[PDB]
Paper text:
Alzheimer’s disease is the most common form of dementia and is neuropathologically defined by the presence of extracellular plaques containing Aβ in the brain parenchyma and intraneuronal neurofibrillary tangles containing phosphorylated tau. Peptides between 37 and 43 residues in length are generated, with those of 40 (Aβ40) and 42 (Aβ42) residues in length being the most abundant. These Aβ monomers tend to aggregate into insoluble fibrils, the structure of which has been extensively studied in vitro by cryogenic-electron microscopy (cryo-EM) and solid-state nuclear magnetic resonance spectroscopy, revealing a spectrum of different polymorphs. Two human fibril polymorphs have been determined: ‘type I filaments’, which are mostly associated with sporadic Alzheimer’s disease (SAD), and ‘type II filaments’, which are observed in familial Alzheimer’s disease (FAD) and other neurodegenerative disorders with amyloid brain pathology. Here, we determined the structures of nine ex vivo Aβ fibrils from six different mouse models by cryogenic-electron microscopy.
Aβ fibrils extracted from tg-[name] mouse brain tissue harbor the Arctic mutation (E693G, E22G in Aβ) and have a crossover distance of ~950 Å and a diameter of 90 nm. The fibrils, which we refer to as [name] type I Aβ fibrils, consist of two identical S-shaped protofilaments that are related by a pseudo-21 symmetry. The 3 Å-resolution map of [name] type I Aβ fibrils allowed for atomic model building of the ordered core from G9–V40, in agreement with an observed predominance of Arctic Aβ40 fibrils in the sample. The S-shaped domain is formed by residues F19–V40, with an associated extended N-terminal arm of G9–V18 that interacts with the C-terminus of the opposing protofilament. The S-shape is stabilized by two hydrophobic clusters around F19, F20, V24 and I31 and around A30, I32, M35 and V40. The interface between the two protofilaments consists mainly of hydrophobic interactions involving the side chains of Y10, V12, Q15, L17, V36 and V39 at the contact point of the N-terminus of one protofilament and the C-terminus of the opposing protofilament. The fibril center harbors a hydrophobic cavity between the two C-terminal domains of both protofilaments, where two isolated symmetric densities can be observed indicating the presence of additional hydrophobic molecules of unknown identity in the interface. [name] type I fibrils resemble human type I Aβ42 filaments, which are dominant in extracts from the brain tissues of patients with SAD. In detail, the solvent-accessible surface is almost identical to human type I Aβ42 filaments but the C-terminus is slightly shifted, probably caused by the bound molecules in the hydrophobic fibril cavity. Additionally, and in contrast to APPNL-G-F Aβ filaments, in which the mutant residue G22 is hidden in the protofilament interface, the G22 in [name] type I Aβ fibrils is exposed to solvents similarly to E22 in human type I filaments.
Numbering used by the authors:
A (entry chain F), B (entry chain H), C (entry chain J), D (entry chain D), E (entry chain B), F (entry chain I), ...: 9 to 40
Amino acid sequence: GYEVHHQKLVFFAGDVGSNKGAIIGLMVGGVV
Amino acid sequence: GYEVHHQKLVFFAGDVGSNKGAIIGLMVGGVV
Amino acid sequence: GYEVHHQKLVFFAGDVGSNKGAIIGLMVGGVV
Amino acid sequence: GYEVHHQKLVFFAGDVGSNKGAIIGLMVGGVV
Amino acid sequence: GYEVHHQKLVFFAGDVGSNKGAIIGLMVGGVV
Amino acid sequence: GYEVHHQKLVFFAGDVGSNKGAIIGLMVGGVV
Amino acid sequence: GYEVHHQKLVFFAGDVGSNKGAIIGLMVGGVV
Amino acid sequence: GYEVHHQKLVFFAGDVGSNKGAIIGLMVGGVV
Amino acid sequence: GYEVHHQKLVFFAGDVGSNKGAIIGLMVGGVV
Amino acid sequence: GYEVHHQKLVFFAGDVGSNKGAIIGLMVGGVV
């Protein structure tokens, strides 16, 4: 018997005002 | 017997005002 | 017996005002 | 018998005003 | 019998005003 | 001036003999 | 001037014989 | 002037014989 | 002038014979 | 002028025979 529930994975749980930059989850190299 | 439920995966659970930038989940290289 | 339900995958669960930028799920290279 | 529940993984649980920089989860190299 | 619950992993549980820098979870090399 | 090239993203760069299991890129929940 | 190149992201760079198990990149919950 | 190159991210750079278990990159909860 | 190169991130650089267990990069909770 | 190169991050640089246990990079809670 296996009971698995209610897992979650959020990257950004909130509110942003005036995002002029970068919100990136996974980057390899590159220039921001 | 297997019971799996209520998993979730969100990247951005929230509200944005005036997004002038970048909201990226997975980038490889490149310039923001 | 297998019981799997109520999984979900959202990228952007919220509201945006004046999106002048980029909202990208998965990019490989390239210039924003 | 296995009972696993209510795990979570957030990167950013909060609110940002005027994000002019970078919010990156996992970077390899590159210039910010 | 196994009972595991309510684990969590946050990187940034708080609010930022005027982020002009970098908030990075895991970097290998590179220039900030 | 922007010069971005030669990015790549592979999940499985190799050879498999007698795959009787599962090779999955991104799963949410469920039983293997 | 921006010069970004030759980034890569592999999950499995190699060879497998007789895969009877699971090779998963990103799982949320669930039973293997 | 920005010069970024030759970044890489591998999870499994090698060979496996008789994989009867699990090779998982990122799991949240669940039973192996 | 910025010169960044040859960064890498491997989790498993080697060979496995008869993997009957678990090779997991990042787990939150759960039973192995 | 910035010159950064040849950084690396490995978790397991070697070979395993008969892995019947667990090889985990980062766990929060849970039972092995």
